[PDB]
C-alpha cells in the first residue's frame, strides 16, 4: 500500500475507442480494480466484476 | 478519484536494475507520487520530491 490503489470504480462504461491498454491493480488494495489507460494516458479505475469491463478486456486481448 | 492513487511512498530507494518504466499519478491524489514499474510489473509509489527518484527518472529518460 506503497502501490497505486482505486478508492472507487467508474459507474458506467467509458467509450471503448478512448481506451488503449489495461492492467489490474495490486490485490493488496481494498477495492482492487481494473485500470483502463486512455489514448490520452488517463488511468481510470473500473469494477472488474462488471460485464462491460470483461468484454473491453476481451477486446484489447483479442485485437 | 476513480483513478489509481498512492496512500504513501517507498522510504528508501529500490534497486535501479529492478525498474523498467515510470509514470506520475494523477495530481487529483492526496499524495500524488511517481510510480516505478519493475521488470516483474510491480507498481511502486515513490516520493517525487526525493533525490533518488529524480536521478532514476533522469536515468530512464537519458537511456
Numbering used by the authors:
A (entry chain A), B (entry chain A): 6 to 68
Relevant lines from the article:
CC-type chemokine ligand 5 (CCL5) also known as RANTES (regulated on activation, normal T cell expressed and secreted) is expressed and produced by many types of cells including platelets, macrophages, eosinophils, fibroblasts, and epithelial cells. The molecule participates in a wide range of inflammatory disorders and pathologies. There are at least three phases for CCL5 oligomerization and aggregation that depend on pH, concentration, and temperature. By multiple sequence alignments of CCL5s from different animals, CCL5s conversely compose the sequence of F12-A13-Y14 (12FAY14).
The CCL5 variant, CCL5-12AAA14 with two Ala substitutions at residues F12 and Y14, resulted in the formation of a less aggregated mutant. Therefore, we were able to crystalize the sulfate-stabilized CCL5-12AAA14. The crystals belong to the trigonal space group P3121 with unit-cell parameters a = b = 48.3 Å and c = 60.4 Å and a solvent content of 54%. The structure of CCL5-12AAA14 monomer was refined to 2.55 Å. The structure of the CCL5-12AAA14 monomer matched the generalized view of a typical chemokine tertiary structure, consisting of an extended N-terminal portion (N–P20), a short 310 helix (R21–H23), a triple-stranded antiparallel β-sheet (β1: I24–F28, β2: V39–T43, and β3: N46–A51) and a C-terminal α-helix (α1: K56–E66). Notably, although one CCL5-12AAA14 molecule existed in one asymmetric unit, it packed as a dimer with two-fold symmetry. In the interface of the CCL5-12AAA14 dimer, backbone hydrogen bonds were formed between C10 (chain A) and C10′ (chain B), T7 and C50′, and T8 and Q48′. There is a one-residue shifting in the N-terminal backbone pairing region, which changes the relative orientation of the two monomers. The overall length and size of the CCL5-12AAA14 dimer becomes shorter and more compact, while the distance becomes closer between the two α1 elements. The native CCL5 cannot adopt the CCL5-12AAA14 dimer configuration because the sidechains of F12 and F12′ are too close to pack together in the structure.
